[PDB]
Chain length 210, copies 2
Amino acid sequence: EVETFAFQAEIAQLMSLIINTFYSNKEIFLRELISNSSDALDKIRYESLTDPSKLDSGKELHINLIPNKQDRTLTIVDTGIGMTKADLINNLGTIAKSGTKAFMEALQAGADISMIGQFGVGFYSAYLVAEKVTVITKHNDDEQYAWESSAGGSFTVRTDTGEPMGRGTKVILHLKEDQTEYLEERRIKEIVKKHSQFIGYPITLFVEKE
Amino acid sequence: EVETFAFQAEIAQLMSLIINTFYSNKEIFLRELISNSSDALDKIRYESLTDPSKLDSGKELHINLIPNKQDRTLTIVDTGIGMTKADLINNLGTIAKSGTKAFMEALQAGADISMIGQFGVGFYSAYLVAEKVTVITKHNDDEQYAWESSAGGSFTVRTDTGEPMGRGTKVILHLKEDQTEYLEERRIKEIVKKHSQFIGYPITLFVEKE
């Protein structure tokens, strides 16, 4: 069963701005997704202080970067708190606690897209480089779910079976054809060193099997 | 009744670094406290979407900046979600969900104190300019409380009566004697325009009665 949902109007507008604005400094998407992973890891780390059974689904707190040139995907994996089904729908489909409104106003008043993370909407910078984004997630309190969107105003949610993750979130970026530089090891290493060198969790760049 | 608590060791260490490191760019404290206020406003805004009774304690979502040259205080007031007693003790007294550890490591690897907000500990930048900080707070689910610390490894919490706020948080900075520039209207206006010009809530700078 696949459920289709409309983005909240302001989120669809934000996504359209990210997709259609001429803006060359696209590499910041990775910093924003790594920052989201770090936040999710902080949350499960904190919850596990008062309740160590929260780590029964996996004690390791880390971030993996998985390029695949055959599938033309870059995957950002973390073992953070994950998202329930309700979290997916609210946090990726609506303004929720984000500064979506302030960001869209700021862009008309001198801000630029690289500041997206200051407004709590860094996730959508994925659409600087991805034609489609799939989010696989598992929270201790829910089953594993797959969220997906190629923008255009809607997203889908379905259960995800056959490859259980334990706990956390996988952001699968199906890259645009002209954005394959972000599958190159040297380029990923450069961007991680530039923007994500102070993250408090290990970031492992996987090697391609080819 | 006044309860005295020890900071978690890493928080005491962080505070000592902020107090003792030579670092002239102190003005960023205001951006960090305004950003915290904005986050707290986002939270009550979001909670009020599904439960409008959460705004029964005050519908206005705003940030006030109150300088007082006679008391040598700068107060940052917001009508955000506020903090319960437990929130005060956990969120100001311990690492909680913050990147305290990563920040202290980053400072030994090329980061500087102006990046404190990237690690979720921007509140403690108050000690760049304040000898003592008092936090008055009211959450819908608890009574009004006053947290206070002059650093030195401890903080106090007591109930706060006689001036009920309704809902939110007041950060009262008892400024160091050489930091009174931050009570000057021109200086506050300059710093707000420099670092907090894209905040999505009204920021009102109060005029002094003197």
